[PDB]
Amino acid sequence: GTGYDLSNSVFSPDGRNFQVEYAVKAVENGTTSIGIKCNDGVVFAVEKLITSKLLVPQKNVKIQVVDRHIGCVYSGLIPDGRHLVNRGREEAASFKKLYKTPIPIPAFADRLGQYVQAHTLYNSVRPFGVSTIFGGVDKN
């Protein structure tokens, strides 16, 4: 029948999660942001739609730092993006506390990956309305 798109963790007849796909629509509606990997680093850039002349220039910072070597930028629901960075900052601090060394980028990528995937397993939680571009420099 129908109604497969009402609940989060529900599989549709064709093996799809519509609530996740509906969250992608919130990202596509959002501001454009990019990331460029260079020869020895990464560069993040983001558009900042000036709604009115009342907005104070160079103040509403969108790009966020995790630890001291990871930069994060996202598109879509800005509050959802901040929630993910807050988790990543806790996740990076937990890694450094136990292993001394700052968290590797592929290691940090999985930590956010497992956390976002977790929000697709239950009907009590909503999927993240953000696509996050992130990275930095580590051991290799």
């Binding site: 910072v61 730092v65 630890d67 001291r68 900052r89 601090a93």
Partner: protein
Amino acid sequence: TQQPIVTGTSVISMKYDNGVIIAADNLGSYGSLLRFNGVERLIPVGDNTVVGISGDISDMQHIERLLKDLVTENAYDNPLADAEEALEPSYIFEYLATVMYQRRSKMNPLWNAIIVAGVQSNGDQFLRYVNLLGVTYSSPTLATGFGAHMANPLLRKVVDRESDIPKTTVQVAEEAIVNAMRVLYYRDARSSRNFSLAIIDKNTGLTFKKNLQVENMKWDFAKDIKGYGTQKI
């Protein structure tokens, strides 16, 4: 409730006309055994604050990690992390003072005596003390443990009260600090010859000096002393 295992002795400090000077030796004692000699006990936080810690070394390393996390946390969502919203010596101390008192209230203290030395954003000198009990106080001169008995009397001869501070130059202040480190090496059995010295000035900034040694020692008079009372040869 715990007991200190690997320990660090005195941390001495004083304030002059333009800033503060702090010093501590590089020893990590294991009871009566002088076990470790490459221990830095002065932790610089930013470029305006230096934290001198005495007592339990394992607890010092914990505090050292907390200070590094404070710098990381302050830079989060803060575009003025290196300007107006940078970590002040007063912010760093008050945080440590809160932790020290909370741990003693839970009967699990950090076995340390800490002196926070630095210069505020407006140019004011900062020098405050906090111990394992959470007891806090400020004075023109501050010293922990054994330095409180020996270095303080010497440093108070230079700056006795608040009015003596603007009359004291960097040259005179450092001379009194280096001299006090020699006296501590003379009479403290848990002291090292090698030490570090940090100067935080409102003009020249932070000057961290490493691998300093106690020089100009008087020992020649020992040859003339023989026996303990009546012995002549």
